[PDB]
Structure formats: structure tokens, C-alpha cells
Design a binder for this molecule. Structure first.
Ligand SMILES: [Ca+2]
Ligand SMILES: [Ca+2]
Length: 291
């Protein structure tokens, strides 16, 4: 079922439970520094907390010299006794970007240790190092998906002791004939399959907001991810979970929480087109994700 939509603005959400509260994190407000943090007791009515990175980290300028003041598209998990917070440092439209990592033993305390650079991109790369997603393979070991535009969604294994990349960089979703207009991966292993969801974006309106949520599955984490029709996500495949409705436009930025909750943003046609946090239960019983 549909849990509801938030009061508070949130874009590119991730969410996690800590004690008697839920925390939802998102892209920082454009006019502020850092990452946006919301807290609630009911996952519906949220209060805005002090942001993460109200002070920027000094190393960011070494990789993204004219980074925008807000950081983007956080991702969080608790693993091996710590919270791991991946996030994006970038500037609007650019593929000169970096994904950073911070760690904590408590979200409510608001203390984060800088773990440094995860992966970066420059104009010389055919991908954009934003929109991280931490996932776990069938052996419980960590991997990172990321990407936005250019040749699309990438995947690397992570070293379980440093939480940074190891091995080769794999390609797992692309839209070669629609301008590379996809972003924001989320990836989970359920019932013997790897599932990849991505946001398909508008390619051609000069704004490139999210538009639909699309999915595919694969027996191996490195793909190919195939949609319900059998089409590979590397060739623009992806079955549409959600294309919005009368009130809620451009759903995207989706993240799978606890295996069976889907959070996402969508833009409120009844409230100035502001992106809000929408949450549904997720069912996998069909072989595929469903509301
Ligand atoms: Ca995300
Ligand atoms: Ca996630």
C-alpha cells in the first residue's frame, strides 16, 4: 500500500530506521550546503534536522573544483557495525563529479567521519560519478552502483574492509538511443535474482528531471538485467513500475529500503511542483517488483 507523501520537500531520497525514528536523507537544498536530513516517528510527518556537511570537506575541490554547495543523492546502509553514507559532489549538468563516503555509529548524534574519495569522473569519462547505491550480493558482500547520463549505470565491487572500489567497472544499464537519460540506480537481491531499478529522465527538455521508474532482473549481479519483455537494460530496456498519476509527476530517485519498501520523490501538482517523499510497500511475489 501507499504509506503517503511527505509534508516536507525531499529529492533523491534514501531512508533508514534508527531506534524509534526513521531518517530520510536527500539532496541538499540548492541554496544550502550539504545533505538534507529529515526525521520522523511515523515515516509520514517529518521534521528537518541539521544537515550533514554544513561545512564542506576540503578534498572535494581537488576533484570537483567548482562544486555546487549542495551535495546530492545520498545513500545509506548499516553494515559491519557502522552506517555508511555515500554521497555525490558535482555541479549541475557536469560529469566532473565525485562520490564520497562518510561513516558513523549514530545518525541521531550527527557525527560523521570522512572516509574520503570513492570514485570520481571527469570530462574524459563516458559516465558521471553521482547517485551512489550500496548493495550486497548473494554472499552478503558489498558492491556499489552509480551513474547519470552519458553511457549510464556502472557497477563495482567494494573491498569489505575499506568500503572502496576493487576490480573492474561494469556497465549495467544504458539508454543509447534516448540520450543516456537514466540515473539513480537501486539494486537488491531477492528470490534468486538481482533486481535493478533506475529512474528514466526526460532527455530533451533542457531540465532532465526524473520521469519514470524502470526495472529489470539478472541471475548475476553484473547482468544483463532483462525487463519483463526480455529486453536488456543496456539497450534501453526496463519495465515501468511508475510513471506518475494526476497529482504526482516525474517519480524517481527511488531507493529500496529493508528489501520491501520503495521510497522515491515525485513532484506535487497540488503544491507548486515541489518534490515530496512518497513511500510504498514493495512486493516481489510475482518474480518482479510490484506495488
Ligand atoms: Ca539514490
Ligand atoms: Ca539504497
Amino acid at each position: 500500500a501507499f504509506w503517503g507523501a511527505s509534508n516536507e520537500l525531499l529529492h533523491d531520497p534514501t531512508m533508514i530506521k534508527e531506534g524509534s525514528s526513521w531518517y530520510a536523507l536527500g539532496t541538499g537544498l540548492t541554496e544550502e550546503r550539504g545533505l538534507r536530513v529529515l526525521k520522523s516517528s511515523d515515516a509520514k510527518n517529518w521534521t528537518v534536522q541539521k544537515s550533514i556537511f554544513t561545512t564542506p570537506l576540503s578534498w572535494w575541490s581537488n576533484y570537483v573544483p567548482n562544486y555546487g554547495q549542495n551535495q546530492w543523492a545520498p545513500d545509506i546502509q548499516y553494515y559491519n557495525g557502522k552506517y555508511w553514507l555515500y554521497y555525490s559532489v558535482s555541479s549541475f549538468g557536469s560529469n566532473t563529479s565525485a562520490i564520497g563516503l562518510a561513516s558513523s555509529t549514530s545518525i541521531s548524534s550527527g557525527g560523521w567521519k570522512d572516509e574520503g574519495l570513492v570514485i570520481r569522473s571527469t570530462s574524459s569519462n563516458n559516465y558521471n560519478a553521482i547517485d551512489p547505491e550500496l548493495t550486497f550480493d548473494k554472499d552478503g558482500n558489498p558492491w556499489l552502483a552509480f551513474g547519470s547520463f552519458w553511457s549510464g549505470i556502472k557497477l563495482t565491487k567494494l573491498d569489505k574492509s575499506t568500503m572502496k572500489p576493487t576490480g573492474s567497472l561494469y556497465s549495467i544499464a544504458a539508454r543509447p538511443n534516448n540520450g543516456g537519460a537514466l540515473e539513480a540506480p537501486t539494486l537488491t537481491y531477492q528470490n534468486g535474482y538481482y533486481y535493478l531499478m533506475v529512474s528514466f529522465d526526460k532527455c530533451c527538455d533542457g531540465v532532465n528531471s526524473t520521469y519514470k521508474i524502470a526495472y529489470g532482473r539478472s541471475k548475476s549481479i553484473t547482468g544483463p538485467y532483462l525487463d519483463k519483455s526480455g529486453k536488456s537494460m543496456l539497450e534501453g530496456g526496463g519495465t515501468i513500475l511508475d510513471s506518475g498519476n494526476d497529482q504526482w509527476k516525474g517519480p524517481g530517485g527511488q531507493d529500496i529500503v529493508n528489501g520491501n519498501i520503495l521510497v522515491r520523490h515525485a513532484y506535487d501538482a497540488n503544491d507548486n511542483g515541489i518534490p515530496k517523499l512518497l513511500i510504498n510497500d514493495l512486493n516481489w511475489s510475482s518474480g518482479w517488483p510490484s506495488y
